[PDB]
Ligand SMILES: NS(=O)(=O)c1ccc(C(=O)NCc2ccc(F)c(F)c2F)cc1
Ligand SMILES: NS(=O)(=O)c1ccc(C(=O)NCc2ccc(F)c(F)c2F)cc1
């Protein structure tokens with residue numbers, strides 16, 4: 233009775249209620265490193281997350297989101313392929329049932345254990361709702377997660393998951409600094425795309441970082457214990473909440489490095 237990632241309502245069925253699923257600028261895509269164009273005019277990214285205000289964490293079925301106060305320019309993204317200022321509103325992850333899968337975007341067909349999406353909207357449009365009606369309304373910063381050593385800054389997240397085990401649950405999540413989730417380098421690939429979950433609006437500028445961050449098997453293991461289901465319904469573990477790569481079509485993937 234609604235979309236999901238299961239056999240009967242997963243990615244292959246989405247086109248029936250969301251026609252745009254077969255559009256020209258659908259995400260995610262596979263990043264072929266030998267075909268991306270090095271664009272020396274691309275500006276360096278400017279991540280200003282020093283006044284970031286996290287407020288809440290919630291399991292909305294699909295995944296879990298950490299929400300941010302976006303009433304003012306407190307956490308912004310600018311630079312890169314962007315024009316104007318973009319406010320951070322929320323972040324979430326996509327992960328798999330095994331370490332060899334989980335990411336949405338792939339690099340040379342290589343899948344990672346998980347992928348972080350830091351969602352921003354264009355301030356020019358006044359509100360999030362208006363921004364999703366424009367070709368350049370959103371900007372999502374994608375980061376790959378590979379299994380290795382633990383990431384200190386991710387632990388705060390891992391510890392609270394127990395309280396939002398089922399759909400609809402939320403918990404206060406203040407004073408979280410998102411700068412703990414960035415890799416050392418800000419080198420990236422960029423391309424025009426869409427949201428990777430319904431309604432699949434083609435209103436996003438994707439910025440995927442080259443350097444993945446590493447997380448322990450223990451940290452990823454805790455992601456896998458969440459539930460798609462709400463309290464009292466049959467248990468359905470939250471894993472493989474990822475959409476398979478889509479055809480690139482009339483698009484060019486640019487690289488900010490050589
Ligand atoms: N100012 S606040 O902290 O209370 C706030 C935080 C999150 C959201 C939210 O996630 N709504 C969905 C939503 C709708 C459209 C978009 F483009 C989004 F990025 C998005 F998160 C809305 C308000
Ligand atoms: N995986 S991803 O980064 O692409 C992604 C990011 C944000 C959202 C979201 O905020 N959903 C709510 C939502 C609800 C109705 C709309 F019209 C929206 F545009 C909208 F984003 C969905 C997918």
Ligand SMILES: [Hg+2]
Pocket residue numbers: 363364365366367368369433434435
């Ligand atoms: Hg749009």
Ligand SMILES: [Zn+2]
Pocket residue numbers: 324349428
């Ligand atoms: Zn996402």
